[PDB]
Design a protein around this ligand. Structure first.
Ligand SMILES: *[C@@H]1O[C@H](CO)[C@@H](O)[C@H](O)[C@H]1NC(C)=O
Ligand SMILES: *[C@@H]1O[C@H](CO)[C@@H](O)[C@H](O)[C@H]1NC(C)=O
Lengths: 57, 162, 54
């Protein structure tokens, strides 16, 4: 899925304090979603591989 | 980015001879490449009121940018612009604002003691903008124009062309 | 004054004359000003004239 992203955070930053906090909150929430989503996905797929291979035998 | 010339012209009492030591070109005497720091011709005479307008005949939107100058002492402003109460206004068919110079004691910085703040607005095809001012206007002489799309990257590392 | 049991919403506006020949006839020759103050809100505005488009 070739969605292309662009910067929203200035590394050489001089930002405000409210909108900065709003942007900070969503990034961690989505980051936790990806971390929680990814960890269960891999651990979930490993279960099938072990189970499937044992069945073919 | 592309460009188109303003076409602006100014009277005999207006000039662009102001120079600042803080910018580096051929010994220091210079100013930005595409903005004009207007000041009075004679010493002790006021800045005349002038109206200026710009037309857009291109098939695409533009981006006009200008600035206003803040002196740092009462002894400074009267020499440059005059003794009257300065004021400038900008109005397009989609924009409207007003600004006023103000002076006061301030710190020292690498270039002189003073400040200038820039402003900008978008202009549509077949649309005009007008500038009314009698001092303090850092009037542009060439305007910018943006086309296409790119990708901004902000880092610090050697480049590789292979 | 509000005597109802619910909040309201009040709107107003300010006039920007487009030439000095306008304001001196409509409003006068003094420096116009306006201030608005509630128990929760406080602001101030000023008319300003200047050449503009059509
Ligand atoms: C937002 O996060 C950045 C990066 O961790 C941090 O530097 C900043 O203090 C946080 N809060 C803001 C920008 O208000
Ligand atoms: C700008 O000025 C030109 C002058 O020919 C006029 O034709 C055009 O309608 C003006 N545009 C606006 C938006 O008033």
């Amino acid at each position: 899925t070739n969605t292309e992203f662009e910067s929203i955070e200035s590394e050489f930053s001089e930002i405000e304090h409210q909108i900065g906090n709003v942007i900070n909150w969503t990034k961690d929430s989505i980051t936790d979603i990806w971390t929680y989503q990814a960890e269960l996905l891999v651990a979930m797929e490993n279960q099938h591989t072990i189970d499937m291979a044992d069945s073919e035998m | 980015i592309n460009k188109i010339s303003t076409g602006f012209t100014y009277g005999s009492s207006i000039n662009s001879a102001g120079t600042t030591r803080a910018c580096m070109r051929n010994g220091g005497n210079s100013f930005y490449a595409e903005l004009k720091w207007l000041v009075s011709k004679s010493k002790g005479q006021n800045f005349p009121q002038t109206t200026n307008t710009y037309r857009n005949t291109d098939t695409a939107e533009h981006l006009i940018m200008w600035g206003i100058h803040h002196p740092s002492s009462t002894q400074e402003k009267n020499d440059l612009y005059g003794t009257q109460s300065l004021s400038i206004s900008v109005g397009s068919s989609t924009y409207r604002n007003n600004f006023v110079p103000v002076v006061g004691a301030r710190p020292q910085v690498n270039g002189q003691s003073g400040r200038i703040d820039f402003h900008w607005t978008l202009v549509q095809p077949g649309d005009n903008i007008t500038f009314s001012h009698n001092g303090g206007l850092i009037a542009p002489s060439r305007v910018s124009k943006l086309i296409g799309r790119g990708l901004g990257i902000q880092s610090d590392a050697p480049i590789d062309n292979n």
